[model samples]
Target: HMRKTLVLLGAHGVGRRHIKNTLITKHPDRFAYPIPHTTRPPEENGKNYYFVSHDQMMQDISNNEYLEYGSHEDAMYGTKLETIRKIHEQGLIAILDVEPQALKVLRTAEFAPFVVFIAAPTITPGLNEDESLQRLQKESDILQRTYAHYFDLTIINNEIDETIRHLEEAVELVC
Candidate 1:
């Protein structure tokens, strides 16, 4: 069987990108971060994103060429199947930090994704809250209700160090 792509879904500041970085940093031989296509201004080195013209991106999106796509500041952003295929061809897990809608497209047989939900830690009423915790809770509340079924594993991101360990365990089971 082919290896599964690790699809990470979580709101900002919930240790989502941390989890992705941990996996790719520790297991470079086994994991890869897929390059995304965007219409935004390119980076100087320009390796992080596949920058394209707005009209070209629109045409590509119309042809069903993207796994997930959306607009930001009038520019489009997306991940392409061709990008992920390149990672898979190298015999590595294609790790994606994506929005929830991305999963709908990635759940296909061709993707073979293992979706992980990095969620907020519990918040006690009447207790003090940090900015990070509050942001996590606010963004995550809608998700467990909306996309819970797709979650193969949900890790409460309390401590980043500990969360990375648990995430490692989950990946070990699958990969």
Candidate 2:
């Protein structure tokens, strides 16, 4: 996999800001991101997310090397420790998108992670929103309780456009 970071910038500013979306998919030239490995066949060869056999995926995850992983179409899609390490190699800032897994491994001085919680919406009932949205609200609540310590700062994402704007500005200042 070509380990890389996800960048989030409005079209107005092409390469300098990252919005609050949580995925290691995009970023400016100065930050590094994670690239996933997949069991799917390589359509892009070297560019195809480090394609390997399904069995290899199963076997590899057995050791729990995957930092994040999931599958579809009888194939695997996951990120590995080595992949993040690859991202960390460059002098650029190591920007990661941590999902259902450990941040403890990288919480050390080595990574110097700064945890930011781009929280899910509260899902106001007055809006008559979908049930799934409500569930996400509850999920976010539970995680806030469960992983409160990891949160260095919390940002509500109820308003996408404005939230992204604030987030973009926030990172632009320090970054």
Candidate 3:
């Protein structure tokens, strides 16, 4: 039986890291922390991100070595394709936390991709009209603007416990 790979893609500061940390804290060994590249110093092996020089990162990008790379607020972040290769080598499901734009680029690539979206709970079924409308509009705009091009299964992370349960089931079914 093959394990499942789960990816959570979304905009920045949308609680993607929170969910990833929650999963890591709860299920320590089931996830892969993506190697990072930054001009910042590498404090330790994994304490801080896998800091790489700016030139090195650019060279890797030119070589098309990264799985998904993005620049926001003048800082570059990316996932190494070799990291995912290692996950597959171990026959384990690797969960990558990538931004929406990165996800769009990756979804159509020539690989067996299983993509999922983590949505905020600002707009659930029951809420006040004005508030719900406002929240729904924001969510709709994000989805339509960023991810409407890709066919991705979206799971609303309203409650952590419920979301985790449903997330496992969702991936299991897909796998």
Candidate 4:
């Protein structure tokens, strides 16, 4: 049996999480969402990320326990190598909801990642037209310029239902 990971990357509020939730909900046996480790103290754990201490995070990074690690606003965030390994060992595809930069390390033969770039549509209702267009352009430009080589597919998230359906087809192709 062949098991591969689905690495989903998108800008904030692009509905990547919603697609993840829908995929897992519909195909729990085929997919497993591995929780990421974070230094921020969010009042809970296990829903999406695993809250950890700064010291512990640094220690693990030094020990090469994390598949990828990044710092943001005095907090560290990472995905543990063991977490993905555990999921893969169960013969299930690990869905890594990670940043675009992490693809540098994860786009290796071992992980066999099927990358899908979720692009946000240009429709920020509250924001000015120019501001919305600028944001959309920047987001799309960064991914296409820097990470296009890593992506297997790109889906513009203009509608939730259509995006989810496309995601499902992409997942089926990789799995």
Query: Which candidate leads the pack in TM-score?
Result: 1
TM-score of each: 0.85, 0.68, 0.72, 0.78
lDDT against the true structure, each candidate = 0.81, 0.57, 0.64, 0.79
Candidate 2 regions with alpha-carbon error over 4 angstroms: 1-27, 46-48, 122-127, 165-175
**Cα-lDDT of candidate 4:** 0.79
Better of 1 and 3 by TM-score: 1
Q: Sorted by lDDT, highest first, which candidate order results?
A: 1, 4, 3, 2
Q: Write the per-residue lDDT of candidate 2 for residues 1-175, one digit (tens) a residue.
A: 1322322211221112244222124444555556679977666744647887888878888986776688789777987777766655764555555552457455555455556666765545455556766666676677677777766567676665666566545555554
Q: Which clashing pairs does model 3 show?
A: none
**Could you tell me which 10 consecutive residues in candidate 3 have the lowest summed lDDT?**
103-112
Model 4 misplaced regions, further than 4 Å: 1-3, 38-53, 70-75, 122-133
Report the alpha-carbon TM-score of model 1 versus the true structure.
Answer: 0.85
- Top lDDT model: 1
Task: Judge candidate 2 at residue 89 and give its lDDT.
Answer: 71
Task: Choose 1 or 4, whichever is better by lDDT.
Answer: 1
Greater-TM-score candidate between 1 and 4: 1
Which residue window of length 10 is worst by lDDT in model 4?
122-131
Give me candidate 2's TM-score against the actual structure.
Answer: 0.68
